[PDB]
Design a protein around this nucleic acid. Structure first.
Lengths: 148, 94, 38, 141
RNA sequence: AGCCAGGAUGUUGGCUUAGAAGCAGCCAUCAUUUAAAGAAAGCGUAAUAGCUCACUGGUCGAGUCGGCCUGCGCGGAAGAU
């Protein structure tokens, strides 16, 4: 541990992501291996670039230190180990979906999908955050509904 | 800025000094300028800690005696011959 | 057993214990290190 | 990939999958088949490049037939066939004598970006510098 | 303090040696991915391998660490009617 001019940096990035971000997931890394986070690296990598950071911060004076500002409901998701996956550019994308599909392959756990702060609930794996750019599905029925 | 507290010595001598030493205090003296030399006691423990630091001897120190700040510099210190202890201190007015 | 006037921790594993008014070094790792004061 | 079994990586040949002195029977004998290493590995070898070392990992357990998998080339040996001196040194590490290229050490790391944790594409090139300065090769950036 | 994890790369540093891959030595004691990982403190070996350790991240959730001064005690302490 340093002093006080190093611990704040972690919170600075935490608050920055917590505040300036979007839909976020959780990954209780109780025994993180080497491919577990490596598999997420590629998953997070797909999303634009390096904006889907996922550090192993579950301290009350670390990841819970930036709860007073934004995401003021991580006090219940601060015990044990909670790897907050704060997003950035875009919205929810397939983060929650991917996480669920990545946590269903026995990748440690995620405290029963605690969830971040976006809607007005808590734990709810929804798949209504996937399509958000598709605009060619309304041009498949035009050369088949003319003859009849 | 080291601030020492001190009391003026009623009785001086060999026996007296010994007694003082026994009771976790130790004698000391101030001398310099026109003013007469002032004999004082000091609490030992407090002063030893202070004197561990090398800044104690170089800088000016403030001795408080009868509610009066005298500014002095540590001139010489008698130490006990085989213990971490102070027999006596010579302070010079500054 | 070494029985010595001077008993000491000889390694990280060596622990000092007093039993029945006898200082003893007991070591989990090395049998040679186990000592007694006498 | 989430679970692994057995793996014996070794610089083999891509031109002809049939060695003896280097590998041969030592490349597979504990349930592995040496007859299934020259009918599937060569199939996915005539659609890229063959001749340089190609580390391979056979997914064999105890069901005879296995599943040949691919890999990637070493980044430390990437400054020999795509830089300058092949050895990369020549004398005891004490007097810098090696060198690299300022125009390279960027597109040579993009080829092996399937094994780099660096989220950013330029972040993977930062790790190459350290691998390109193993002995102390001074680049003319 | 225990408890759960890692304890990597260049790299097995070169030699001289029969071999030397942290661990026969002799010598340099550097750099990388950085949360952190000693060209390695102990075990281990034909030597690798393998098993620990250093430091560090987590759990936990209040005191804890080892010097100084002195009091009293313990061991050191076996003899012949």
């Amino acid at each position: 541990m340093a002093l006080n001019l190093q611990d704040k940096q972690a919170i600075v990035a935490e608050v920055s992501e917590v505040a300036k971000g979007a839909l976020s997931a959780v990954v209780a890394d109780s025994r993180g291996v080497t491919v577990d986070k490596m598999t997420e690296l590629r998953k997070a990598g797909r999303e634009a670039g390096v904006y889907m950071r996922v550090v192993r911060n579950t301290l009350l004076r670390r990841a819970v230190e930036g709860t007073p500002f934004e995401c003021l409901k991580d006090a219940f998701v601060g015990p044990t180990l909670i790897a907050y996956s704060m997003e950035h550019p875009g919205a929810a994308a397939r983060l929650f979906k991917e996480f669920a599909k990545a946590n269903a392959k026995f990748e440690v756990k995620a405290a029963a999908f605690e969830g971040e702060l976006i809607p007005a609930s808590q734990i709810d794996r929804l798949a209504t955050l996937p399509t958000y750019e598709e605009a060619i599905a309304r041009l498949m029925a035009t050369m088949k509904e003319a003859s009849a | 800025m080291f601030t020492i507290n001190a009391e003026v010595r009623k009785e001086q001598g060999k026996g007296a000094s010994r007694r003082l030493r026994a009771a976790n205090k130790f004698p000391a003296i101030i001398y310099g300028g026109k003013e007469a030399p002032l004999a004082i006691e000091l609490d030992h423990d407090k002063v030893m800690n202070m004197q561990a630091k090398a800044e104690f001897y170089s800088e000016v120190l403030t001795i408080v005696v009868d509610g009066k700040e005298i500014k002095v510099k540590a001139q010489d210190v008698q130490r006990h011959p085989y213990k971490p202890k102070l027999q006596h201190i010579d302070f010079v007015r500054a | 057993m070494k029985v010595r006037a001077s008993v000491k921790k000889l390694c990280r594993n060596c622990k000092i214990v007093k039993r029945d008014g006898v200082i003893r070094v007991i070591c989990s790792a090395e049998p040679k290190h186990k000592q007694r004061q006498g | 990939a989430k679970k692994v079994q057995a793996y014996v990586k070794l610089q083999v040949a891509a031109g002809m999958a049939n060695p003896s002195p280097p590998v041969g029977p030592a490349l597979g004998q504990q349930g592995v088949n040496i007859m299934e290493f020259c009918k599937a590995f060569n199939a996915k070898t005539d659609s890229i490049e063959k001749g340089l070392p190609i580390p391979v990992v056979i997914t064999v357990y105890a069901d005879r037939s296995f599943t040949f998998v691919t890999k990637t080339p070493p980044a430390a040996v990437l400054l020999k066939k795509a830089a300058g001196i092949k050895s990369g040194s020549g004398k005891p590490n004490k007097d810098k004598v090696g060198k690299i290229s300022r125009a390279q050490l960027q597109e040579i790391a993009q080829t092996k970006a399937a094994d780099m944790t660096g989220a950013d594409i330029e972040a993977m090139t930062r790790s190459i510098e350290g691998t390109a300065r193993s002995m102390g090769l001074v680049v003319e950036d």
